[PDB]
Amino acid sequence: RTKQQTSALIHNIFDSHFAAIQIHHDSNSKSEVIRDFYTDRDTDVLNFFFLSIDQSDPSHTPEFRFLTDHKGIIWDDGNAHFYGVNDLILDSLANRVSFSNNWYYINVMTSIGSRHMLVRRVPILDPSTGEVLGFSFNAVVLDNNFALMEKLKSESNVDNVVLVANSVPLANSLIGDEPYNVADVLVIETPIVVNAVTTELCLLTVQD
C-alpha cells in the first residue's frame, strides 16, 4: 500500500536533480563567455566561468562537460579522465548524442569498469545570426555517485538507497556500519522511467 508514495517521492527527487542540471545547462549555454571561447579559445577564462556557476549550486552540477564544434571536441573540463572516459570514448559520446535538448542513457565499458551515464547536448548559438557554433555536452555519471545517493536518501528520509542496472549495483548510500550490506538488499523497487521511456535502472530503498 505505502510502497506507492515512497516510489513517487524518490523518483521526484531523482527527476529534480536532472531538471535542475538541465535548466543550468540551457542557461549557461546562452552565456557570452562560451560563445567568445569559440573565437579566442582561452581555457583559463572558460574554467573560471564554470567554477563560479558550480559554486552557487554545487549539488546540481554535471560530473563532466565538453564542447564541440562541427568537426569534433574542442574542450573538455578534464573530469572525464578519472572516470575512465578517455578521449576516444568522449568522441563516441559526441557521435551517439545526435539530438539536442534530450537526455540519453548510455552504458559503456571503459578500462576501469562500466560507466552508466545520462548525457545531453545543447547548441551554442550566435544570438544575432542564428549560427550554431557547436554543442555543449553535460554528463552525469551514476556509478558510485556519492553526492547523488546521499541526496536521494536525505530528501526521501529513507534509511538507505541502492541504484541498480539489470540486477547489478552501481551506487549506494550505505555508511558501512549497518546490520546489512548491499547484497542483502538485492525492500521497495522503483524503476527509473524518464519521459515514459523504461530504462534498465532501478532505485532500491530500505525502510526496514
Binding site: 562541427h70 548524442v97 545526435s98 539536442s100 537526455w103 545570426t129 549560427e131 550554431v132 519521459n195 530504462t199
Partner: protein
C-alpha cells in the same frame, strides 16, 4: 544509446511492434489501390466529428476532408459528419469551449488535427473518459505516455521519413566528405526531426562534413538572411539542406543574388510554390507529399474497424522525390496522384 524522449519514432514504433508494420503496410497498399467497398453494412450511419483550425490561408485541410468524404462514399459507408473549427489565436478556455461541439455529436470517430500538447487535456479526456475512437492528424510519432491505451489511429506525413529520402538522394549524388550547410527551421521539433535526422544520416552513410548550420525564424526573409551569412563565412559548400519551404525559397534568392546557383538546394513538402521553382530549375530537389493519402487512409481504417479487422496504430502517407530533371509530364502526374480525390 537510449534517447529519453516522450515519443516513439515512426520506424522505431513499427520495429518495436512488428505486427504494426504489417498492418501499416497493408493500409499503405489499400490507400494506393482502388476502393474495395465495406463488406459489413452498419445498422445506422456512423457519426464522425472533425476538428480543424479555422482561418487557414492554405487549403490543406479542405483537401483533407474532401479526400476523406470521397473515400467514405466510394467505400459505401453511410455517415453523418460534424465539422468543428477553433480560432487559432483564441486562448485555451475559449478553444476548449469550441471543442465541446465535437463531444455534443456523440461521435463514433473523432478526428483531431490540433496540437496534442496544447490540447493534451482534451485528447486525454477523449481517451480516458469517452466511447469515441480518436484519430489524430499531423502526428506520426506515438505518445509514450499512452502506451497502455493508444488512439485508434495517428496519421500524417512523417518528417523523419521525408528527410531520410532527401538524405538518400543527396548521398547518391555527392561523393564522400562533401561539404554542406544546413538552414534549420526555428529552434524546436521541426528542426530536430527534419534537420538533425538529415545531418545524422549523411554524416553516417556518406561521411559528409557539415560546414555550418543556422536556426532561422521560419520565414523567407530569415532563410535569405541565413543563407547570405552562411555563404559569407563558409562559401565552399556543394549544397545547402533547408528544413522548410519558405526558408529554402529565401535561400534561392540569396543564391541568385550571389551568383552561387552552382550550390544545390532542396525544398521540403512539394507544394505549388516549390514545384514552380523546381520547373524553373531554381530548386534542385524536393520531397513531395501525396496529400490525399491521409484522408483516404482514415476512411480505410474506419472501414476495417467496421469489418472487425485490426487497424494499425500509425500511418505515414507516401512521399515522392521530385527533381529539376523531371519532365513536366512527370510532375503533373505526381500532382494528379497527390490530389486524386481533392481535385474536382
Amino acid at each position: 544509446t537510449q534517447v529519453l524522449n516522450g515519443y516513439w519514432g515512426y520506424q522505431e514504433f513499427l520495429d518495436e511492434f512488428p505486427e504494426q508494420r504489417n498492418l501499416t503496410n497493408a493500409l499503405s497498399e489499400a490507400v494506393r489501390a482502388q476502393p474495395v467497398p465495406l463488406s459489413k453494412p452498419t445498422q445506422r450511419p456512423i457519426k464522425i466529428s472533425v476538428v480543424y483550425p479555422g482561418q487557414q490561408v492554405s487549403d490543406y485541410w479542405v483537401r483533407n476532408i474532401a479526400s476523406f468524404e470521397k473515400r467514405l462514399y466510394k467505400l459505401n459507408i453511410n455517415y453523418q459528419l460534424n465539422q468543428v473549427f477553433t480560432r487559432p489565436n483564441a486562448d485555451i478556455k475559449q478553444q476548449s469551449l469550441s471543442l465541446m461541439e465535437a463531444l455534443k455529436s456523440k461521435s463514433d470517430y473523432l478526428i483531431f488535427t490540433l496540437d496534442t500538447t496544447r490540447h493534451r487535456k482534451f485528447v486525454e479526456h477523449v481517451l480516458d473518459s469517452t466511447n469515441t475512437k480518436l484519430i489524430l492528424q499531423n502526428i506520426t510519432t506515438p505518445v509514450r505516455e499512452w502506451d497502455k491505451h493508444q488512439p485508434f489511429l495517428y496519421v500524417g506525413f512523417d518528417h523523419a521519413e521525408g528527410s531520410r529520402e532527401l538524405a538518400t538522394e543527396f548521398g547518391k549524388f555527392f561523393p564522400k566528405h562533401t561539404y554542406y550547410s544546413v538552414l534549420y527551421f526555428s529552434e524546436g521539433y521541426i528542426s530536430d526531426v527534419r534537420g538533425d535526422t538529415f545531418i545524422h544520416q549523411v554524416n553516417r552513410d556518406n561521411n559528409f562534413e557539415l560546414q555550418s548550420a543556422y536556426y532561422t525564424k521560419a520565414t523567407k526573409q530569415s532563410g535569405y538572411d541565413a543563407a547570405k551569412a552562411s555563404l559569407a563565412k563558409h562559401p565552399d559548400v556543394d549544397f545547402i539542406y533547408a528544413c522548410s519551404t519558405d526558408v529554402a525559397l529565401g535561400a534561392v534568392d540569396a543564391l541568385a543574388e550571389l551568383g552561387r546557383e552552382d550550390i544545390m538546394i532542396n525544398g521540403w513538402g512539394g507544394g505549388s510554390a516549390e514545384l514552380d521553382a523546381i520547373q524553373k530549375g531554381d530548386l534542385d530537389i524536393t520531397v513531395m507529399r501525396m496529400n490525399d493519402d491521409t484522408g483516404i487512409a482514415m476512411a480505410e481504417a474506419i472501414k476495417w474497424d467496421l469489418e472487425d479487422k485490426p487497424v494499425p496504430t500509425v500511418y505515414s502517407g507516401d512521399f515522392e522525390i521530385v527533381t529539376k530533371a523531371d519532365s513536366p509530364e512527370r510532375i503533373e502526374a505526381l500532382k494528379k496522384r497527390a490530389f486524386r480525390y481533392s481535385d474536382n
